[PDB]
Design a protein around this ligand. Structure first.
Ligand SMILES: [Au+]
Ligand SMILES: [Au+]
Lengths: 122, 126
């Protein structure tokens, strides 16, 4: 496949695909007799993984490590699990933060008719 | 007040304060006899609103619009409206993080968590 198809299939922008290549986070694409990029199911898997890991909160470095673990035939599922539970703790904190912001906005909204909001924000 | 005083009082950097002005998000300050910016309590109020609006979820334009409403002599329900949409947006964000947490905790529970290569987490993420 060419980069365009890989994009449509993975839900990543060509920009992003080329980016992960520049960072060395995914297996480089192959070059054809013409000098253009072609990918295989293997590249599709690595990129899919990378996309979903970013979606669930993993940053770049971590996402790359997951690709490494993915390509490691002798990976320890325990290592992946520890990383996943750590990531869960972070998501929990992130949730607590957003909840704290939501309560403050709701308080401001409560004290308002149809302006405490603006007055207290400045 | 000069720009440095405003920075100390609001906690914003002088670069940030110059940025807000450059983007017309706040009222431009006047000039002193020597050509330096002079601020008034109105500037402190706009910059504070802007800093707190951002800290509580609003983006730049939304913050700029909140500042425009602030300066208006007249819109209780026009702000309560914006405020409540920002809350709906946050709740949706919370809903999404919760969903990712549960999904990761489901995969982790299915994980052997041992020295074998079989891994449901890696498998259902790639
Ligand atoms: Au209000
Ligand atoms: Au696992």
């Amino acid at each position: 496949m060419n980069i365009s198809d890989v994009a449509k299939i993975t839900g990543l922008t060509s920009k992003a695909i080329r980016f992960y290549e520049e960072k060395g986070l995914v297996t480089p694409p192959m070059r054809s007799e013409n000098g253009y990029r072609t990918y295989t199911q293997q590249h599709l898997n690595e990129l899919t993984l990378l996309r979903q890991a970013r979606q669930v909160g993993f940053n770049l470095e971590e996402s790359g490590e997951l690709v490494n673990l993915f390509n490691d035939p002798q990976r320890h599922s325990a290592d992946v699990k520890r990383r996943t539970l750590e990531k869960v703790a972070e998501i929990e904190r992130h949730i607590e933060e957003l909840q704290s912001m939501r309560d403050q906005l709701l308080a401001l909204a409560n004290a308002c008719p149809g302006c405490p909001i603006i007055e207290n924000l400045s």
